[model samples]
Target: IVGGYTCGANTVPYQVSLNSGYHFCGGSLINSQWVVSAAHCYKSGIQVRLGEDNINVVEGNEQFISASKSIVHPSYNSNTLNNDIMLIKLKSAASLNSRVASISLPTSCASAGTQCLISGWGNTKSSGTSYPDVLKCLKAPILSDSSCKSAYPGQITSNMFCAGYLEGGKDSCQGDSGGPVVCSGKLQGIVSWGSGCAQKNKPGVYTKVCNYVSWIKQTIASN
Candidate 1:
């Protein structure tokens, strides 16, 4: 994440790294056996690593579990990136502790201007590559639908929302997709797409998580 600071140990227990020999995306622990990410990050085999503060080191508090199944939204559109959310089911329930835990999902939509936190081990720069080993986090504000629409006309949908500064500097970038965009301690969005990493007038677009609450609950209950 650009313009962010390194996260302290276990500061973001719900944050997870979706891996395949290397960290490719980020996710949030929604429950002992479930994780939520962006559909665009889908892969056949994935290892979900919890309590990971530094991606390059084996932090003793980490739990590496394989994902058994993934449920992508039925109406997901790859071209437009609408309904970009996805749910990953773990092979076994995670052992929750101070360094590993689940974050609550948002019950209602977040309003514009709400300050939210975004975390990941993604690129630290907008133009070039610079992935950080330690998880980075930044606080940004949610933009109004009108403001988001003006930034990316016809791209903003009800299933999507924008967050970050209009003048640029801080945002989730490559390798951060599928990560958490939390507001009020609840999971509100998932890193999806954007015009460019932390570009002026182009905030990071996320999967509007509150719109998929029922889908998450139903899929978890039945599957």
Candidate 2:
């Protein structure tokens, strides 16, 4: 069955768990000593858990760690979802394991027409129910910057990247925010927004990781 760790008392999917009562959304282990996630996912009195298969089954033996500190992107704007990224500094470094492997963030993003994978335990359908314990994954083609501009002309920005099926049926829904959009085995983007989950012609947008290389590096270094 589906089960893993979670963050927050909201019980939303994509939320992560640690040892104490802390919750967060999609995070990537940047290095042996660091993990990255969205600033919005951060809250006081939270912990982080690694190496759990699913939330429903609360495996007691997963690696849990306390966050020494969290560094949210200074430019983060929840309304527009710009710069909605953050880094989590664990109290101590973690040992590598199969279930708790680290993911790399791309220094450069894939160009238009590149395919990417987005995964989360969010709502399966638009404005639908959040998956309590199941993680869902979808493959989407990266839209050109210009095309993205056309799709949401007034909203698309240079720091954002768009992906989804024009015909719909696949996208980041509620509880999917702050998740990762992986490409070439690296994290290229973080799930940010869309008109509605899985809506036709409305692809999900993400924070372009490559655009914030300096910010990411500095955040990690400072923390």
Candidate 3:
């Protein structure tokens, strides 16, 4: 992520690292067993690491667990990247401790101009192939759909939203997918994709978590 700096290990305990031997995406623990991430990151045989800061080395605070099931939104569109959210069922509920916990979901839609923090272990630059050894966090502002649409015409949907600096410094990049956009102490969005790291005028696009509240509850209830 652009303009990101290293954060404390316990700052955001609900962060989940979706790994297939190595981390490819980021996620969040909404509950002990369910992880919220981008549906585009759905893959088999991937394990998750909770309470982890450095992926290069596993600290004692880490809890390793397998994903038993993956439930992606039925309406996700790959072409437009609409409804890019997914939920992962942990094989076993994560063990709670000082460094592990769950995040609270938003009760209502996130209004434009709300300030939020984005965290992930993604690449620091777009062309960079290296993933950060430790997690990174950055601050960004949520932009209204109309303003976002100016940057991405016909691509911004109700299911998707935008957040970042139009001046081009701090924004989510590749490998940050499925990570979080936390606002006012509540989960707001999921990192989906963007034009490039942090570019002029184009903000990072994310899956609006608020739009899927009902679907999330229904899916978890049925399963």
Candidate 4:
């Protein structure tokens, strides 16, 4: 069985590897030249694979680009996990083929009540292990800043965005951190933290993509 992580109420998604047999959490293709994922997934000697149902085997001749560099948010705090985002620069740009495509990033995503999709290989049930197969995805409604503050009550920060079922039972769990939270077909957030896997009154927290626009652009330009 493969390790699974949570990304809201969707099916469990797992990380896939091409060069090595190891697996992590799911990730999103931001562009031909870059991929967005959680900084915690930055383990040594591994690469990300997407668009497969089963992670144990390679389904097609998906493009494999060597990671040239990994740029994590400089302000990321491991203890509180603030600014928990990262970008992986591929050695070369990927071809926009049927199997590989990039997700767009939203410029104005701070508004409340946005609907988004969160994908990963997290547990289908709370306290469950990671999945071994390909990634899984599900839809979640974004919570307003005020609502999230009320839900988490004083833990919310400006750098974080909130989403999940208000009644609970849907959220990003272990191994799901660092994956993309997309809204309106645009990349809007990155999985960051949550109190428990799918717990009531505990919405899943994520890194706001809109807030990091300058940083992402500058980092990519510098590299």
Q: For model 2, how does the per-residue alpha-carbon lDDT over 1-223 read when each residue is reduced to its tens digit?
A: 0112333232222223433342336566667667767666767654666654464556653566778887778878878777878777888777665555677767677888888777666666465465656455677889877767777878977889888776777777766666777788778888777887776777778888998887778767776
lDDT of 1 by residue, 1-223 (tens): 9999988888989999999999999999999999999999999889999989988999698899999999988999999999998899999999999999899988899999999999999999998998899999999999998999999988888999999999998888988999999899999999999877989998999999999999999999998
List runs of model 4 lying over 4 Å from the truth.
Answer: 1-21, 130-132
Model 3 pairs in collision: none
Global lDDT of each model?
0.93, 0.67, 0.89, 0.68
Best first by lDDT, ranked: 1, 3, 4, 2
Q: Model 3: how far is 64 from its true place, Å? A: 0.7
lDDT of 1 at 5: 91
Best model number under lDDT: 1
lDDT of 3 by residue, 149-217 (tens): 999988888888889988887888888899999999889999998897888988999999988888888
- For model 3, the stretches where C-alpha displacement exceeds 4 angstroms are 126-130
Model 3, position 47, has a per-residue lDDT of: 95
- Index of the highest-TM-score prediction: 1
Residue-by-residue lDDT tens digits, candidate 4, 1-223: 1112332221322222323355555567777777777776666555656445555555574555677788878988777777878888778777765556677777786467777777765556666654535465657888888878887776777888788877877777765677778788678888888877787878889888888888888888888
lDDT of residue 152 for candidate 1: 95
TM-score: model 4 vs. ground truth: 0.85
Models sorted by TM-score, best on top: 1, 3, 4, 2
Instruction: Give per-model TM-scores.
Output: 0.98, 0.84, 0.97, 0.85
